[PDB]
Amino acid sequence: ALYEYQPLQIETYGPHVPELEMLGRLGYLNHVRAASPQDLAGGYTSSLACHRALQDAFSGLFWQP
Amino acid sequence: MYHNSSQKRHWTFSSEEQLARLRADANRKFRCKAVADPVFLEPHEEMTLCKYYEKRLLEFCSVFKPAMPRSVVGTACMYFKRFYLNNSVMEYHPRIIMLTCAFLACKVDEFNVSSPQFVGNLRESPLGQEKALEQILEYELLLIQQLNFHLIVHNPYRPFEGFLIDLKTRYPILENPEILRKTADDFLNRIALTDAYLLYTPSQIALTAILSSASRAGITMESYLSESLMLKENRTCLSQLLDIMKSMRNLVKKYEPPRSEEVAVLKQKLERCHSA
Amino acid sequence: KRYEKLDFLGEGQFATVYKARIVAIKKIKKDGINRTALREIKLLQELSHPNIIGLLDAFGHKSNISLVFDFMETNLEVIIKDNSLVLTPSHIKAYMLMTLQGLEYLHQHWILHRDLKPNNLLLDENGVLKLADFGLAKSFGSPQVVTRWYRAPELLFGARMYGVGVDMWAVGCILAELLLRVPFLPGDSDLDQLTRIFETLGTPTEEQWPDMCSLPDYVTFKSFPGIPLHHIFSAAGDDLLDLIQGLFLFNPCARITATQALKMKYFSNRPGPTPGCQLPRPNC
Numbered sequence A: 001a002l003y004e005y006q007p008l009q010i011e012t013y014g015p016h017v018p019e020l021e022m023l024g025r026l027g028y029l030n031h032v033r034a035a036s037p038q039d040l041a042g043g044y045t046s047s048l049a050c051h052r053a054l055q056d057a058f059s060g061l062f063w064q065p
Numbered sequence B: 001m002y003h004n005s006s007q008k009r010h011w012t013f014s015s016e017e018q019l020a021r022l023r024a025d026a027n028r029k030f031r032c033k034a035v036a037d038p039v040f041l042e043p044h045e046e047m048t049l050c051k052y053y054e055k056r057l058l059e060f061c062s063v064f065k066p067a068m069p070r071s072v073v074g075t076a077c078m079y080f081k082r083f084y085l086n087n088s089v090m091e092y093h094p095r096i097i098m099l100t101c102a103f104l105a106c107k108v109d110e111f112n113v114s115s116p117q118f119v120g121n122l123r124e125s126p127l128g129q130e131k132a133l134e135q136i137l138e139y140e141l142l143l144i145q146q147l148n149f150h151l152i153v154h155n156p157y158r159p160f161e162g163f164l165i166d167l168k169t170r171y172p173i174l175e176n177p178e179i180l181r182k183t184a185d186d187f188l189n190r191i192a193l194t195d196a197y198l199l200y201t202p203s204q205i206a207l208t209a210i211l212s213s214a215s216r217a218g219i220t221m222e223s224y225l226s227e228s229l230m231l232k233e234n235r236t237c238l239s240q241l242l243d244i245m246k247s248m249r250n251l252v253k254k255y256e257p258p259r260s261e262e263v264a265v266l267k268q269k270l271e272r273c274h275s276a
Numbered sequence C: 001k002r003y004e005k006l007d008f009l010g011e012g013q014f015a016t017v018y019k020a021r022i023v024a025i026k027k028i029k030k031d032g033i034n035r036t037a038l039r040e041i042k043l044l045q046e047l048s049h050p051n052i053i054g055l056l057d058a059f060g061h062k063s064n065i066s067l068v069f070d071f072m073e074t075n076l077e078v079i080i081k082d083n084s085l086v087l088t089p090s091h092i093k094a095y096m097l098m099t100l101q102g103l104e105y106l107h108q109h110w111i112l113h114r115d116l117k118p119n120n121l122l123l124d125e126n127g128v129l130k131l132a133d134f135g136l137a138k139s140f141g142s143p144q145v146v147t148r149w150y151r152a153p154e155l156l157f158g159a160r161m162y163g164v165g166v167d168m169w170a171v172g173c174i175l176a177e178l179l180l181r182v183p184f185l186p187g188d189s190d191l192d193q194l195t196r197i198f199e200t201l202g203t204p205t206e207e208q209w210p211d212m213c214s215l216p217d218y219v220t221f222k223s224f225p226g227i228p229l230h231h232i233f234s235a236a237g238d239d240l241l242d243l244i245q246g247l248f249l250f251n252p253c254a255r256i257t258a259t260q261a262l263k264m265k266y267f268s269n270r271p272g273p274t275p276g277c278q279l280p281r282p283n284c
């Protein structure tokens, strides 16, 4: 029984969030703080912060109790 | 994340009527326990006292040293609101519960503060500070158990920042989305006073604050909802969102701050209740 | 209380765990309730995945708190240290698959485990692997951790801000331990761990890590050629060697994430991962 990758299916009840690799091409990174060389050395990029902020802004926007 | 959080699952309610029912049930339960009288305060008086002590908690966290992150203050306020949904001020004193809420919020939000420097922010004698610390340590487990062990609180500040980033990126019509920050922050502060945190999602609250600031600035961004957010495909979703924003604005506009004379009378009544 | 002590499961870094009636209870050690237990509760009350341990209950008195989890039969360290157990490539594939799925679910919710080791990978009698010991787990994304043997080189250089790479390096170390049945890089100090890493894999240059010197606790090492990967793992296939190479990249940005590793050809190749009901079980 071979394995086939299947992406995680989690409903967010909000607008679609652009992909992390596409944030730079779409101009999102122009409005976040640029990561310092030390942050890049440790593996931290501004794309992560922008993606998290965008995910938080859209989560549960179309949901009612 | 919020879309599978315990805040959405267990601490977001349909309407203010359910909140009033829960508060009345708590008051009635404490009255029944006491029986098993004019001194008892009514649920609306309990609400007035809770609002006054929430303001006291806000000004306590405002002058906290070292500087307290705003997320910690929001977490403490949410803890206070959740605790007094199913508890009466006539059983647990809100003066100590606010301090326990601030203590637990500082612990949960990874804001490292030791107990001596926490109690040093109180305008009390060292003996009074030690007594307050002992009360906080006694009530910490009670606060945790009354929260159903749901300590992660989602605040509208991160969704607000994300919405601002999206407006700066995909909405050239709004030339400078940074001019709406102050009024949106004021609207968020006014939202925090009402029961909006227990009835709406943080993203909805942030969007409501942003569009309230835009309306007060004379800017209309119905295209941002319809076009940028792809709501022109789903019209009923747009109508529901607009109705949610209108309900939030109505909640904000009808809130009445507590009055000093009533606050003093209720404080005397609460002191009489707790002494006896 | 409602629980009766049965056995003694061991001592953690911050608590004493025992088997009770089946569940497992951690007894956490003027500051109030311990921050590690609060962190574990606040993080495990927000996650729901088959490969993540679920917090069942919590109680205590005043500033003493006790946590109750579902009881797991064993952990991966007992599996590895057992000399009577044969770790076939299918078993290794299944263990890595469960670990990577759990870590992908954890990372999508912006949480780093930061304490990953074979003893923290719990196994039940049904063969399901779970991640536990979230007392050091932290949320990341908003602008001196992990055990030394499984600590990433960027952590050993005093990195303050990091991402999923610190978990993926530990995952690579666990994979190497599964392959060799012994700890891959068993150092006794941070400098010794860095020396062992550079001897086994080679000293990285400015092309494999474009910001080596930016880290505060960074020191210059001798240039080691590095042992070839197929020399270290003689039985590893080409796809497994590619997965190991991706897992052990010195650049934390270039290091493969959990989703990227799950998409790799190693997991989709043959044979398929062993089902949990057929995974090796330590004999009594």
Ligand SMILES: *[C@H](CC(=O)Nc1ccc(C(=O)Nc2cccc(Nc3ncc(Cl)c(-c4c[nH]c5ccccc45)n3)c2)cc1)CN(C)C
Binding pocket: C009, C010, C011, C012, C017, C024, C069, C070, C071, C072, C073, C074, C075, C078, C122, C132, C133, C282, C283, C284
């Ligand atoms: C005969 C048959 C038999 O079953 N023998 C046997 C073999 C192996 C083990 C074993 O290793 N058990 C074990 C070790 C460690 C941990 C656990 N489970 C567990 N579950 C929940 C939690 Cl939260 C933890 C945990 C988290 N952090 C921790 C730190 C330290 C210790 C635990 C811990 N662990 C199971 C047992 C039995 C047996 N009889 C005679 C028939």
